[PDB]
Amino acid sequence: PHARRALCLLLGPDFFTDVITIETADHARLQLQLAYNWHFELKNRNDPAEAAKLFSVPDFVGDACKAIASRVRGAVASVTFDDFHKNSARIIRMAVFGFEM
Amino acid sequence: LAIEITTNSQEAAAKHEAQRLEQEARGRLERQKILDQSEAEKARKELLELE
Numbered sequence A: 001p002h003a004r005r006a007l008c009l010l011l012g013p014d015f016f017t018d019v020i021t022i023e024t025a026d027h028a029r030l031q032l033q034l035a036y037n038w039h040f041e042l043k044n045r046n047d048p049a050e051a052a053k054l055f056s057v058p059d060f061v062g063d064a065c066k067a068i069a070s071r072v073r074g075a076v077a078s079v080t081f082d083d084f085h086k087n088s089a090r091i092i093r094m095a096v097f098g099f100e101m
Numbered sequence B: 001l002a003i004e005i006t007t008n009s010q011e012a013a014a015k016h017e018a019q020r021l022e023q024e025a026r027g028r029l030e031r032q033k034i035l036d037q038s039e040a041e042k043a044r045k046e047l048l049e050l051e
Helices: A048-055 A060-076 A081-086 A088-096 B004-050
Strands: A019-023 A029-033
Touching (some): A019 A060, A060 A088
8 A cells, every 4th residue: 555655756667566366257266467567648748737647646556556457357257267368468458448449 | 166167168179179180080081991992992803804
């Protein structure tokens, strides 16, 4: 919840070596190490409002990890263990940002 | 149970594909037994002519 603390908000591309405890439709309890290749986006890097919107969430690392973990777990919950392992990366990556484009 | 069902399903499908290879094998096994007996009888013609 609160382990690291730094004066700077890292905007450059990075990752989170997070592990989740998900459960598929076959109830198969498996933990799985995630990365969350992330980067902050600013279209106008001088506007005070947008720039201060960076510090909106004070625990953005945890927010990103929890949101992706929740959505991943919810989507793998609808598939069997066989499906979650055949299309492992496929279903987890569509789990994070489920749409059709 | 919900993972053993997956194991059973994949092993059953592989058993069916193994039977596929076995049955296709036996299938042209028959035909090639057949075609070699064809040639054998073709010249058993000369056998029994001259015998």
